[PDB]
């Protein structure tokens, strides 16, 4: 799956301004840009707090946290029939595409992704912490 | 016993009877003698005099405070302080514990066992509340037959 490229020419929803937006974490650490294609001019609830008029075409919204992108994204996936993707933008200029990684949402299964962080045992077959004293490994990562 | 005089010969216990009627007699001085609130204080005085003559006649032990103290060791003089009303209590408390245990067995073998605890089946309840009268013969009878206790293989146990 070829990841989508951030166009940086699509415009923003009509928003009057909020104080819940980008603080200095955007300036020095990261900020998140969510891009989605709209059928028409609607009104959505801003995850920073407030309401904005979303455009009739593609939209770009700048968010500070990854949880704000899913809270917006699941809002416009259930109330609206809008497919969305978001990115992670760093202050040096690198845009890191984040979701969906295979192009299909993680609720649906894809053959391309692999199992990572999966234990072949259960919780009751995890080892006791007394027999794993003074090691980098712990009771669940082995 | 335990350095306590009997309350019938205690000078402090008779002092508390004297200063309790005198408190109630001074309350009676500001009422008419045939008035309705004066009949309540006159009934209070006769309730007080009945109380002090009952405590001294039961062999109660009074300390230096003039107050009746209970000996709960199991003394042959002092059975009605703890042993006699304790056996009266445990019979009644075991009655509560036996008819609540027998109700849960009677509703566990039902179609909807959780609707019979918010809505208690009174014909099922009242037919075993009578049966809780003879409960030491039915608790130790279930203890000897093994029906009182459950084996630990059928008991939900949290893991180590």
């Amino acid at each position: 799956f070829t990841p989508p490229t951030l166009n940086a020419d699509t415009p923003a929803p009509i928003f009057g301004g909020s104080t819940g937006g980008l603080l200095r974490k955007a300036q020095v650490e990261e900020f998140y840009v969510i891009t989605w294609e709209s059928p028409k001019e609607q009104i959505f609830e801003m995850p920073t707090g407030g309401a904005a008029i979303m455009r009739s075409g593609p939209n770009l919204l700048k968010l500070a946290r990854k949880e704000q992108c899913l809270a917006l994204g699941a809002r416009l996936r259930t109330k609206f029939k809008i497919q969305y993707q978001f990115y992670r933008v760093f202050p040096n200029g690198e845009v890191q595409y984040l979701h969906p990684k295979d192009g299909v949402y993680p609720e649906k299964v894809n053959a391309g992704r692999t199992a990572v962080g999966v234990n072949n045992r259960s919780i009751g077959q995890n080892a006791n912490p007394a027999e794993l004293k003074f090691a980098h490994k712990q009771a669940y990562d082995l | 016993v335990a350095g306590l005089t009997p309350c019938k010969e205690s000078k402090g216990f008779a002092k508390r009877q004297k200063q309790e009627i005198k408190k109630l007699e001074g309350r009676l001085k500001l009422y008419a003698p045939d008035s309705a609130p004066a009949l309540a204080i006159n009934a209070t005085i006769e309730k007080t005099k009945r109380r002090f003559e009952f405590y001294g006649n039961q062999g109660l032990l009074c300390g230096t405070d003039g107050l009746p103290h209970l000996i709960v060791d199991g003394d042959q003089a002092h059975l009605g302080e703890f042993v006699y009303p304790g056996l009266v209590f445990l019979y009644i408390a075991g009655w509560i514990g036996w008819v609540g245990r027998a109700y849960l067995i009677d509703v566990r073998t039902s179609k909807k066992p959780t609707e019979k605890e918010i809505i208690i089946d009174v014909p099922l309840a009242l037919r075993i509340m009578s049966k809780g009268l003879t409960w030491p013969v039915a608790a130790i009878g279930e203890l000897r037959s093994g029906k009182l206790v459950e084996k630990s293989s059928n008991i939900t146990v949290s893991p180590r």
Binding site: G124, P129, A130, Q138 | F13, H69, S158, P159
Partner: protein, 732 residues
């Protein structure tokens, strides 16, 4: 590698929590990163040396302040009418009433009156002048310096001891029982005999005349010839004044029992014999285990061989020697369990059998010294139980402990928790119902309708000790028992005179209020034991969450799912039982201070009539004794209790401030600090200032700890103030 350097996972935290948790994970050495066995035991060994140095540098400054700013000689001339001075006060915030009001004990300036019983202790032991206390302070400065040198030395790689030396339990027990408990109590006996007994008898024995001042008229002749009774030949009479030669005897090791009749305190000849006895028996008990010489015991085979053959204990104690020896938290929990049971045995035996001269007469000092060891013992016992929980998470191996007694505690842990729950519920309904019933009967004008239960079991034990007040007359109160006739020529002439006296605190006359508050005490110990046994045995897991061991010891929660898992951890059971030890020891020291505050001014009938119901506790104890507490400073003026009136209010701040952390929880404050971060990042002239730590709210475990510590500081300061202001302002 930022602060904290011992944990790599906290160094990458960009928030304030990195600053916080590095303070609180500082001594949890086994949870550190890149961390081994040898570094664990050597860092613990040097931390022990630093602890010893802190204790000795503490005692040095508590000796230096008595020798420098305290009137120890003036208290030695008259210990009944001179207040013992702790240290001078240099406060720039005093006005002239505060300087003129804190000047006590005949001092030249504002001083603090010592309620720690160090004057009574140092007087009884032999220290008389300020120069002796100064020499002791310099000597313990040298001892703490030597312990710092030894702590630095054992971290050097030439003198690093291996873990096999650290886990040598047999040699440690032999040299602890022989050396720490035996040669130190025999050293003591050599002090008490050489110095403290002749300083009680007026002879000035110091280091310059140690080899010339003979402690007995015939010294070390009758010791080696077998006739030890020469050392009990001429005891101190009842006309003996303490510190003076008149009325004194020559015997160094007596067995009189009871009290010195002028000080109402134990005899130094008895405490010398006591230490020669707990010195012979500890040096003999220190030759028990096998170290290097063929004879002795292996404790592994003692624990292996102690299996009942009926299988009621399973495998018995098989595998427990490696379980204790490998787990530092098992040894620390055992040490704190024993230490709490003996810090409470300290508290119970220094008020009833005062060991130091003129300590029984100084009332608020005795009150402080009971409350001290009962709070330090209710935090040491809870630390023992918390360390049992930490052992069950990070140190208990179920494979090594297979069907032994320790595994069988986990096998029937619901029976233990449910029966502690039944006992706590029994004590709570019964104690609350009887106190509320007695409250209703005093409210309804009828004191005679109370359920008052004479505590005839403990009164029978007091009559078994020799109290003729109750007239049980079984043994040691009747002359027909063999125990009395075996004791009436040996120790009982002192003991019966001490226990039949009604002015002392030796086995006080107890009543129905004592019965009721002893069930309050049993409620407190049973419910604290309930929460702590529940934390220790549900430490690895439970039916709500079976993998509590894999989340560590002090994890916050497990989420709102499965009903809700707040305070599920074993640290949270320790947290909830710190409130229960505070309530327990609050009840204990309320009972102590009110049983004694009515004894000391004479009217024990106030306690005998008022302790049976809680309005007597509120009115005649909490309200009546606080009369001169909160009047320590007024609009009209301020008294000498004013610092105790501020420290009382101060406690009501900090305790209530703990409620802010114990009621309000994290995410309110996290959104509040989010708004504060926006406000700082948008304010002109203040946006220029940055934070490097991201401001976050206090985390959930940290919130419970901060509220618990505030609760504890307020609780110990409200009672330290009330207790040291309602006995020292109204002496008696």
């Amino acid at each position: 590698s930022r602060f904290p350097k011992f944990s790599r996972g906290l160094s990458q935290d960009p928030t304030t929590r990195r600053i916080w948790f590095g303070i609180a994970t500082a001594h949890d050495f086994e949870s550190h990163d890149d961390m081994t066995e040898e570094r664990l035991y050597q860092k613990i060994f040097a931390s022990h040396f630093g602890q010893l140095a802190i204790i000795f540098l503490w005692t040095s400054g508590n000796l230096f302040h008595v020798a420098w700013q305290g009137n120890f000689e003036a208290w030695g001339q008259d210990p009944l009418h001179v207040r013992p001075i702790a240290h001078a006060i240099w406060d720039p915030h005093f006005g002239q009433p505060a300087v003129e009001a804190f000047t006590r004990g005949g001092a030249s300036g504002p001083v603090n009156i010592a309620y720690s019983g160090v004057y009574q202790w140092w007087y009884t032991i032999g220290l008389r002048t300020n120069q002796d206390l100064y020499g002791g302070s310099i000597f313990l400065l040298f001892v703490s310096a030597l312990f710092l040198i030894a702590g630095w030395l054992h971290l050097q790689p030439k003198w690093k001891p291996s873990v096999s030396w650290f886990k040598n339990a047999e040699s440690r027990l032999n040299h602890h029982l022989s050396g720490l408990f035996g040669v130190s109590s025999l050293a003591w006996t050599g002090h008490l005999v050489h110095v403290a007994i002749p300083e009680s008898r007026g002879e000035h024995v110091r280091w310059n005349n140690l080899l010339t001042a003979l402690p007995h008229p015939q010294g070390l002749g009758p010791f080696f010839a077998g006739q030890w009774n020469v050392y009990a030949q001429n005891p101190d009479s009842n006309s003996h004044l303490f510190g003076t030669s008149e009325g004194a005897g020559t015997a160094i090791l007596t067995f009189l029992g009871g009290f010195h009749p002028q000080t109402q305190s134990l005899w130094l000849t008895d405490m010398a014999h006591h230490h020669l006895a707990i010195a012979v028996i500890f040096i003999i008990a220190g030759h028990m285990y096998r170290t290097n010489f063929g004879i002795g015991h292996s404790m592994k085979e003692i624990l292996e061989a102690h299996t009942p053959p009926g299988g009621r204990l399973g495998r018995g104690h098989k595998g427990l020697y490696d379980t204790i020896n490998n787990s530092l938290h098992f040894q620390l929990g055992l040490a704190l369990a024993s230490l709490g049971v003996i810090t409470s045995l300290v508290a119970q035996h220094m008020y009833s059998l005062p060991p130091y001269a003129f300590l029984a007469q100084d009332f608020t000092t005795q009150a402080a010294l009971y409350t001290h060891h009962q709070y330090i013992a209710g935090f040491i016992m809870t630390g023992a139980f918390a360390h049992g929980a930490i052992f069950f998470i990070r140190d208990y191996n179920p494979e090594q402990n297979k069907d032994n007694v320790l595994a069988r505690m986990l096998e029937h842990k619901e029976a233990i928790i449910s029966h502690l729950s039944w006992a706590s519920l029994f004590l709570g309904f019964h104690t609350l119902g009887l106190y509320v019933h007695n409250d209703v009967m005093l409210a309804f004008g009828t004191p005679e309708k109370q359920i008052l239960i004479e505590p005839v079991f403990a009164q029978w034990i007091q009559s078994a000790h020799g109290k003729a007040l109750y007239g049980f007359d079984v043994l040691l109160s009747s002359a027909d028992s063999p125990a009395f006739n075996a004791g009436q020529t040996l120790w009982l002439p002192g003991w019966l005179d001490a226990i039949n006296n009604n002015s002392n605190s030796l086995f006080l006359t107890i009543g129905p209020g004592d019965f009721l508050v002893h069930h309050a005490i049993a409620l407190g110990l049973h419910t604290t034991t309930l929460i702590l046994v529940k934390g220790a045995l549900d430490a690895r897991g439970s039916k709500l969450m079976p993998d509590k061991k894999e989340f560590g010891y002090s994890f916050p929660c497990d989420g709102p799912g499965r009903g809700g898992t707040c305070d599920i951890s074993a640290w949270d059971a320790f947290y909830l039982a710190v409130f229960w030890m505070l309530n327990t020891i609050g009840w204990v020291t309320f009972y102590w201070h009110w049983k004694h505050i009515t004894l000391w001014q004479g009217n024990v009938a106030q306690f005998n009539e008022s302790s049976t119901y809680l309005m007597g506790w509120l009115r005649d104890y909490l309200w009546l004794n606080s009369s001169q507490l909160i009047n320590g400073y007024n609009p009209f003026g301020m008294n000498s209790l004013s610092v105790w009136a501020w420290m009382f209010l101060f406690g009501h701040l900090v305790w209530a401030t703990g409620f802010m952390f114990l009621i309000s929880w994290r995410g309110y404050w996290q959104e509040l600090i989010e708004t504060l971060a926006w406000a700082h990042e948008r304010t002109p002239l203040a946006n220029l200032v940055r934070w490097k730590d991201k401001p976050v709210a206090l985390s959930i475990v940290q919130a419970r700890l901060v509220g618990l510590a505030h609760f504890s500081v307020g609780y110990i300061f409200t009672y330290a103030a009330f207790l040291i202001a309602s006995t020292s302002g109204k002496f008696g």
